[PDB]
Design a protein around this ligand. Sequence first.
Ligand SMILES: *[C@@H]1O[C@H](CO)[C@@H](O)[C@H](O)[C@H]1NC(C)=O
Ligand SMILES: *[C@@H]1O[C@H](CO)[C@@H](O)[C@H](O)[C@H]1NC(C)=O
Ligand SMILES: *[C@@H]1O[C@H](CO)[C@@H](O)[C@H](O)[C@H]1NC(C)=O
Lengths: 430, 187, 137
Amino acid sequence: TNFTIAGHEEFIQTSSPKVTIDCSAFVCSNYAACHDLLSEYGTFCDNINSILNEVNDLLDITQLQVANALMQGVTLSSNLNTNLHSDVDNIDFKSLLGCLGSQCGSSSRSPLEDLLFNKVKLSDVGFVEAYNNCTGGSEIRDLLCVQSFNGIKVLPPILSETQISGYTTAATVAAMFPPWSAAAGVPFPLNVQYRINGLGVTMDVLNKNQKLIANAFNKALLSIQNGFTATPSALAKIQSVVNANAQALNSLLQQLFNKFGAISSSLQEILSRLDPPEAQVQIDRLINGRLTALNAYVSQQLSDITLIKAGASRAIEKVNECVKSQSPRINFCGNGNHILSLVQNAPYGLLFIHFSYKPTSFKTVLVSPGLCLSGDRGIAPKQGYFIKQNDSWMFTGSSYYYPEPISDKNVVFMNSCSVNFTKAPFIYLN
Amino acid sequence: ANAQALNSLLQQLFNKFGAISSSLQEILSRLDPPEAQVQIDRLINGRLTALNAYVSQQLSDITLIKAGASRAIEKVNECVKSQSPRINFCGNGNHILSLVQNAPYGLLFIHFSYKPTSFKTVLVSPGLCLSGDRGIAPKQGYFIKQNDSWMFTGSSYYYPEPISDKNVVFMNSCSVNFTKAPFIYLN
Amino acid sequence: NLLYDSNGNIIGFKDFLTNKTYTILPCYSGRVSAAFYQNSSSPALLYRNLKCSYVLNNISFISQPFYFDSYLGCVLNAVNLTSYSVSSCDLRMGSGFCIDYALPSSPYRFVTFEPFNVSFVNDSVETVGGLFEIQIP
Ligand SMILES: *[C@@H]1O[C@H](CO)[C@@H](O)[C@H](O)[C@H]1NC(C)=O
Ligand SMILES: *[C@@H]1O[C@H](CO)[C@@H](O)[C@H](O)[C@H]1NC(C)=O
Ligand SMILES: *[C@@H]1O[C@H](CO)[C@@H](O)[C@H](O)[C@H]1NC(C)=O
């Protein structure tokens, strides 16, 4: 009998830190006697670098495909500024829009994306800052500088997060103002009313509750923005990915302190205590151990990049068929009563804002699945039920209780009625 | 890519792996078995490690290929042999039909799409408020006012036509933002 | 008199002749990215996360007249043309930047990378007397 609007958030991992390893510097950093034996293999480091380059190329292709899916078939107006935006039919979109024309220049994200990126340190710019703060004495024992001094460094993606934020802002604006490219040319309130009516709600209560829908949307946006202050299930995934990457990097770096059966794990003592003829065996054992570790690492990276490819394909599908258009598939974008979905920029992925139809109060009403009218003809409802009010059969919606007269727009005609249909010869085609 | 993988796998056979040479002929013709055992064992270990890396890369590649082939099978089932109401799946929104052709190590898809050539600027309304607290809304189109008369036109082609029952929806009430027009007696 | 780390490394000591305390840190070590064109005579150099002054005073010992500070690092043998944009590149350096080669100053151009754009229309945004302006084919 009464309903509201609920909002939900969802994060899907799309990108990944592009890790590049200098095999020669990782094994034989500053020792010529080590290089004289590492060149006796060569192809190990060659194949490691080749696999890393292939993974980086796959990541770049994935990012390009995501950008293409975000910026596919978008048409905006030239006279569209930030000041003359962020409000449509009493619905505020200030926390979801940025600036893409006659407006801000260098990197400037929306408040929601700002709150998202402020909770994550190792972002696309965090690695760059930590790498450029190595020279100067800012940090004493920073782990990233130590990894960089051993040939392990992370490269930034080919597209910065500013371009992704701009694409997301453009895709969001494409559904708020004419010509409504993201809504197939349908205005926002009319599209929302159509999506709500598609669930079995009459149009009268939707036309008489124009302000309630806007109030519910604003309340849902405010609730999401307030809940993002804490650590929900969506924000924890980015932290888990960052922690897993850091743990993998630390486990790879700790391989330089193992002896692998040698007298010491450091080449300084081996070269300052024994002769090269007595040190070649230890150097070869250390090289074999480090090469085995690097092979295990690149295999794990291949598995991870395959999983990330699958996740990014899923994310691209959801962006194409839940955000830019309304797909007639149930339980795909939301949970049964899906209405609208929005996209936002997130570290190493995207953020989805799903709006659903949530009732508040119910009512026990006796319904009928069909009536046998006069003349031996069948009548069955279309996404509704037949209710009897004051000894008269009426019609009501499946998702909302609203009696209305029976017409040709809600029933189907049959030349024969079922035996399990209630006999009602007193009612005719009104 | 396949050729480069095969080339690398073949060139891996010319590495010494710390031995005196990369060929077994010279090792067997120069040294005795008690001294060639270690060299042969190191070569065998290196070649086995290379083969393990190669088969792991092949497993990853065949996983990716199976994923792509599943995507292709879904696309063939939902775009070529049938018309799906899914938007932005078989094309760019204006997709009409698709055809499949045999291709080396894959398939070739031929997609036909709707592409306009000319445009013109008109004034439209999201809805109209009829007389008697009645409201109407266009279905896959807009409302245009031509010669002091409200008409209907499509969203992908400009072709005015009179308002009918199959083109609009009927409501028991009209919104406040709908333009009032009580002269539309087209019930 | 010696400060050790959890892994057994020397990170500090105390001198005996002067009773002073110091701290030992490893010296800098890194790589260099070379963007080389097909028929070029010299590639472009990029020292990621390094200033041009530090490279010229500690690393670079070769006379290089072309140098400027960028977001990624010190770029050598290239000009600063970030105001120009392109739609496709073969040498992507990162963070939305690219290096373009001009057929014959340095023949390399350091520009931005914008692979996707949005179409614009001259229609209005607000209601023109209660009606919207939509272009119909
Ligand atoms: C309805 O169908 C059930 C089983 O199909 C049957 O047992 C029952 O008698 C039917 N009711 C009427 C009124 O025909
Ligand atoms: C350093 O300290 C020791 C111990 O107190 C002392 O014997 C010595 O004279 C000191 N050296 C100097 C140069 O002050
Ligand atoms: C927009 O992108 C397309 C596709 O990459 C490109 O062909 C076109 O030149 C771009 N437009 C501008 C103004 O760069």
